[PDB]
């Protein structure tokens, strides 16, 4: 705003830690076929 820490910084601080956990929950809500393929005998386990 006018006086205070700037809105770019005070919403980047709120949202930049949220992007990594969004990527984590999407990489484990769509990426568990990779985790089940990784242990099977098709990958010469």
């Amino acid at each position: 705003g006018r006086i205070g820490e700037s809105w770019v910084i005070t919403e980047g601080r709120r949202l930049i830690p949220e992007i990594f956990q969004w990527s984590a929950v999407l990489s484990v809500c769509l990426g568990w076929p990779g985790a089940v393929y990784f242990f099977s005998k098709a990958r010469k386990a």
Binding site: C29, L30, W32, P33, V36, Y37, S40, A42
Partner: protein, 534 residues
């Protein structure tokens, strides 16, 4: 008690019976899904040794039983019969004997469908029961006749319920309900009851044409003799797409209400949302042959239908965008129907995106009668209609049944069905794009992994339903003790921030529809006097 449950022309005591046949048939259909996915777990003839006709019988039983005896009762019949008179202030519905005969001709369709799977090995065609696979030369016996008499009876039940619903919310509204002031579930049941009597006459005409060219020697689809089996594909899918739009539109209504009441915010633009839903209804008839891109239509009419199914896709998109807008900025109280409402958005957006991947008539030649299609509809039908069904039960049954459930068991049931149903239908997409066809007993043993992963998931999805059965029991014998002894949640709408507890106990329920103002289990004559509104 015989006149209160067998004659019983009162729309509150018909919905409980609708729900009882719904939970019975859903248990039978998921036993069939367990048997199917238990036999498809590994290549080579498993538990049912050989006998592909038995697997065809099991898959048509699972499909048609769980569509026309779980989802359509427990969404149209049960929920509409209990809530459509109770939201517009009618004392109960118009034509009461009509929605008593609708319920009472449901389970005789159920018992003839059950006894159709026993005589002369059995009807195996799949739920889209096609000629000349079902004509008397390639399929002899009285099995598929009883299997489609079940569809005649369920068709009659749903049409009688549709006429009942249409007149009982076109005339017996309360004092101040105008033509656009109804809550959105009333509008969903309205438009669904229109699509029923605009669609299923064509279905019943086509399947009685199938019956009287089976047994009465006519030649509608017997091809050596003049007819053609493409006419059945037209006459079936002209109902077959409006049928699933019928099955999913009250899901949209239920999800709209629960995200409206668990985020302390009205829905973002209710008038544009009901215009989108009504245009989805009146547009869902014009795209009936997107299930027939392979059979030999011209490229011009295929171009028309792949143009029109994307304009089918757009108002569902603006509905999901309005749902994100009405949960944005709220005060979201994450209880167990709000969890199902949150999961429905993601797990139906996923199926709708793979549906518009299917909707290209160009792209449907690589995906037809293939497990990609199963991954699409077992998203948007299963997760869609039944996550809305669970977000209907866990949200309404403390008011209807009057017994509060257990909360932590409801959340482990939600997470178990969410995990254990996301692990089933997600490898179906890889099975589809790798080349697995539908309705095979089992398969060439290349793709031997994803079927095993889906089968280890279906046991989780069945164990969660066993825990839902225990939730029903714990609600039925420990309702008052879950009211008192601090195991449940009691107020679905939390008190606001600057409001005291002594001030919350004045205005306990901040509703926007009538249903949460009636007492737990409501009186048999609730609206003695009309319920005024400005």
């Amino acid at each position: 008690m015989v006149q209160r449950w067998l004659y019983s022309t009162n729309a509150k005591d018909i919905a409980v019976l609708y729900f009882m046949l719904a939970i019975f048939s859903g248990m039978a259909g998921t036993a069939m899904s367990l048997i199917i996915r238990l036999e498809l777990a590994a290549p080579g003839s498993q538990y049912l040794h050989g006998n592909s006709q038995l697997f065809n019988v099991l898959v048509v039983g699972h499909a048609v039983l769980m569509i026309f005896f779980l989802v359509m009762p427990a969404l149209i019949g049960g929920f509409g019969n209990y809530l459509l008179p109770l939201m517009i202030g009618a004392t109960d519905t118009a034509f009461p004997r009509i929605n008593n005969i609708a319920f009472w001709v449901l389970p005789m369709g159920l018992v003839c469908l059950v006894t159709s799977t026993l005589v002369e090995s059995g009807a195996g065609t799949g739920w889209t029961v096609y000629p000349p696979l079902s004509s008397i030369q390639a399929h002899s016996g009285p099995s598929v006749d009883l299997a489609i008499f079940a569809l005649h009876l369920t068709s009659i039940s749903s049409l009688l319920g549709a006429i009942n619903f249409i007149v009982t919310t076109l005339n017996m509204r309360t004092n101040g309900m105008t033509m656009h002031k109804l809550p959105l579930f009333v509008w969903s049941i309205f438009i669904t009851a229109f699509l029923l009597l605009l669609s299923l006459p064509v279905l019943s005409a086509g399947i009685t044409m199938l019956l009287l060219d089976r047994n009465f020697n006519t030649s509608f689809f017997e091809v050596s003799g003049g007819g053609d089996p493409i006419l059945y594909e037209h006459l079936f899918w002209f109902f077959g797409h409006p049928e699933v739009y019928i099955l999913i539109i009250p899901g949209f209504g239920i999800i709209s209400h629960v995200v409206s009441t668990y985020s302390k915010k009205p829905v973002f633009g209710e008038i544009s949302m009901v215009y989108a839903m009504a245009s989805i209804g009146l547009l869902g008839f014009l795209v009936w042959s997107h299930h027939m891109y392979i059979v030999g239509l011209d490229a011009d009419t295929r171009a028309y239908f792949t143009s029109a199914t994307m304009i089918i896709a757009i108002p569902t998109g603006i509905k999901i965008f309005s749902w994100l807008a009405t949960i944005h900025g709220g005060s979201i109280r994450l209880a167990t129907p709000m969890l199902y409402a949150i999961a429905f958005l993601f797990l139906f957006t996923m199926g709708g995106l793979t549906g518009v991947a299917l909707a290209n008539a160009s792209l449907d030649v690589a995906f037809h009668d293939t497990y990609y299609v199963v991954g699409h509809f077992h998203y948007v039908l299963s997760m869609g209609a039944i996550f809305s069904l669970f977000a209907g039960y866990y949200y309404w049954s403390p008011q209807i049944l009057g017994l509060n459930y257990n909360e932590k068991l409801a959340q482990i049931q939600f997470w178990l069905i969410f995990i254990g149903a996301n692990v089933i239908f997600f490898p179906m997409h890889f099975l589809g794009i790798n080349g697995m066809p539908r309705r095979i007993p089992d398969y060439p043993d290349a793709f031997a992994g994803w079927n095993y992963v889906a089968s280890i998931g279906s046991f989780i999805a069945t164990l969660s339903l066993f825990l839902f059965i225990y939730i029903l029991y714990d609600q039925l014998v420990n309702g008052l003790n879950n009211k008192v002894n601090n195991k449940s949640v009691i107020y679905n709408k939390a008190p606001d921030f600057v409001e005291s507890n002594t001030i919350f106990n004045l205005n306990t329920v901040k509703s926007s529809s009538i249903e949460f103002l009636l007492t737990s289990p409501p009186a048999v004559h609730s609206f003695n006097t009309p319920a005024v509104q400005s």
